[PDB]
Symmetry: C2
Subunit: 464 residues, 2 copies
């Protein structure tokens, strides 16, 4: 009997901001209990260090550099199909694949993969959608509904999508509670629906917490009243509210007897933003970086029927693995011609085998005139940040990327740079960029200039 699949995806959760991954000040007892009863992934990576492209990769199973979606959609992006402001519809999502294999599919919370009808969740493999289409949202309906009406009362032609009414399959959601609590409430409802249907479920629970604005319930803040920094205190309360809902979700799974045969996957979509309450310790950097802190995230698998308790999986994996792993477990057939950049790791997880032995896990982030790069194989990682000289780290011994080994092992450095450059030969042009500056640089050819990105000696050689 095929398992249910529950993906709990948080938004900008820092590497050190759940108990099972080292937090000393944020309490996440429900998440910790799930993690201790499953497999914790100590080297898990998303395919891009910020929101839109990471989510594009999770659902398409491809790097955003291959689908044209490596920039975020701007807020209030176009809602007209003629404008193709969304992930290409030809790139079939794993939700549609699971849907075509008889799964009850549900998407809750944040989307950010296109606000026009052809990009809507109900058209991309989801029987049920409850959430918002853009990149973020205010958390309290009492506050943001008032603002929305008032802004209509002045005929405001550019109302921020952070205050738009949310929707349930295209109709007004009429949410009445702190939206983290509402998304938990909708997850429970959809679990009860699938149980009543005696149908396996796939639920994509995309919390916007703890993404800005930092807004939290008074009852949650009180659990952290001793934290003096206000942003950290509020951020902790936000993470705690997600934890409360996972505990309620777990109770529902047990009452409906779906707990033992549900694969629960929990992760963050990118590294924490350390300007807005997050802590990525012991990693270097912040959301958006190709330092580990940008795209290495907490993650666990929990599936009592098959994954042993107290497991730690220390081999590097990618969020790109979720697509082939889920379609495999679903016994689903892939669409003809579907290209995938990850692999099914369920067997590797059960037997503690290395899925990426002698293979690369990459990141490339476009900047204003240059690219940040990161690439890991085994214990070795190469990094370029700020267009500075290339760095080589033994990421297993130097998790903080403090000791540059490029000088001691230049052969390894250039071999890893060679493979990474070849990878960028397969890229497509971005379907959209983010800023006016971006558009100029790509039109002038100043971007992408992958050739300059993979220079090595001239960055370090003296001309004298």
């Amino acid at each position: 009997t095929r398992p249910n699949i529950l993906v709990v995806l948080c938004d900008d959760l820092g590497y050190a901001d759940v108990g099972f991954n080292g937090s000393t000040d944020i309490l996440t007892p429900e998440l910790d209990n799930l993690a201790q009863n499953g497999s914790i992934f100590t080297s898990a990576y998303v395919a891009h260090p910020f929101c839109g492209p990471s989510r594009s990769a999770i659902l398409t199973g491809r790097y955003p550099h291959l689908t044209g979606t490596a920039y975020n959609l701007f807020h209030n992006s176009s809602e007209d199909d003629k404008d193709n402001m969304g992930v290409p519809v030809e790139e079939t999502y794993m939700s549609k694949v699971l849907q075509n294999a008889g799964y009850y599919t549900s998407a809750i919370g944040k989307w950010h993969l296109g606000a026009a009808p052809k990009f809507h969740p109900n058209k991309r493999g989801f029987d049920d959608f409850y959430g918002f289409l853009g990149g973020g949202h205010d958390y309290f309906p009492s506050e943001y509904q008032k603002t929305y009406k008032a802004q209509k009362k002045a005929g405001n032609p550019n109302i921020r999508d952070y205050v738009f009414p949310m929707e349930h399959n295209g109709k007004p959601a009429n949410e009445t509670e702190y939206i983290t609590d509402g998304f938990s409430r909708e997850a429970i409802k959809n679990i009860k629906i699938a149980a009543a249907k005696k149908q396996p479920f796939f639920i994509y629970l995309a919390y916007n917490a703890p993404h800005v604005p930092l807004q939290a319930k008074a009852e949650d803040v009180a659990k952290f009243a001793h934290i003096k920094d206000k942003d950290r205190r509020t951020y902790a309360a936000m993470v705690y509210a997600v934890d409360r809902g996972v505990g309620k979700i777990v109770q529902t799974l047990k009452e409906t007897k779906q707990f033992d045969n549900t694969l629960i996957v929990f992760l963050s979509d990118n590294g924490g933003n350390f300007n807005h309450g997050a802590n990525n310790y012991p990693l270097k950097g912040t959301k958006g970086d190709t330092w580990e802190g940008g795209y290495r995230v907490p993650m666990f698998f929990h599936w009592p029927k098959k994954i042993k308790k107290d497991q730690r999986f220390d081999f590097p994996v990618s969020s790109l693995d979720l697509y082939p792993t889920f379609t495999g477990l679903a016994e689903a057939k892939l669409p003809k011609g579907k290209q995938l950049d990850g692999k099914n790791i369920m067997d590797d997880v059960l037997k503690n085998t290395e899925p990426y032995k002698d293979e690369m896990i990459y990141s490339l982030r476009y900047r204003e005139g240059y690219n940040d790069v990161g690439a890991r194989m085994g214990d070795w990682k190469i990094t370029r940040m700020g267009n500075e000289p290339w760095r080589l780290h033994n990421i297993t011994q130097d998790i903080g990327e403090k000791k540059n080994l490029a000088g001691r092992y230049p052969d390894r450095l250039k071999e890893m740079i060679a493979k990474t450059q070849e990878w960028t030969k397969s890229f497509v042009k971005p379907l959209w960029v983010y800023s006016v500056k971006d558009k100029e640089l790509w039109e002038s050819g100043q971007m992408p200039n992958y050739e300059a990105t993979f220079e090595v000696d001239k960055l370090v050689d003296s001309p004298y």
Copy 2:
């Protein structure tokens, strides 16, 4: 009547790495006692976020962008006067000005302002020099002398200058102890020389501690044995050896009865490198950045005859202020046509008045194809890092530069950028650059492109 002047300049000391500036694990009792008995500067800035240009600025009193010295000299730089690898000799150092006013002048420790004879300290106003000409040095003579000899006897043509013999006025120094201790002993020796000559002294004590290589005496490491991280522990021991030497220097000043009429200035030449043991809390960033962490440094003035005890000076100051402050105290006349970018602040310190009201304290750091910028006026700072969109901070309320207010106050942002851009209009071309990549970009005009640096709207506007 005129005071003695002792400049204690550490190398790469982190903002939180002395007791008086908030350190909780590194002990600096001697430095703290001086600071408690003088004026602590809570918003002190050096003129560039790394070694060479900052030091050029301290001795010339000018921004390195105006003297052509905003890149480091490469290690083992040219020793022939013909190649002009050094600070322009026409830019008169404050040591020469003080020399010409009857001061006994002495330089100790690190130089890095040119290794050719016309750039030598003895030709730049220093009666005495004891140290090394380049940018760093190994700490234990038993080890680096052995290496230097072995490699000299093998005719190695590329001996690292980190192991060259140190010198005393052009002759071999024959150092026999941990060079931090060796430098302290020389400061004591030069204090007694000035006393015997019945001359006011100016001592430029340029410790290379706590700059890499992290090397410390075992007896000093033992005092920080509860520090678990090996690099943090050695670094703590290196800072401590500087503190011990400051205490011995203080004892000498009392025996020679020079203590009360000596102005002791203590500061770091730039922010701490957080990859090599330093801690810049609560600032953001690291050595080399235009975040506060790159160029805001600890600093105190200690001068019992005039400066009151337990003072805290909270208005922003610059290390460029030391040149006109010292010559003012020396009652010296400036060379005809000498340009200075700082101001005499001794009166402002004694009366607690604002030296930079409605005026700017700047930083601009060249990167590979773009510029990092920071500029502060009053409570307000603008920051551009990594060519990202411009940031505006109230650094008095937001010392960590976490909350960008550029959207909230675009009028202030644009006026501060306008003033900063006009400042860059006076810059000169670098006399040298640092890497081959640097040279290509400057010859093609890809650098400096100050015009692109001060773009604002195109970095945040959507093109759709």
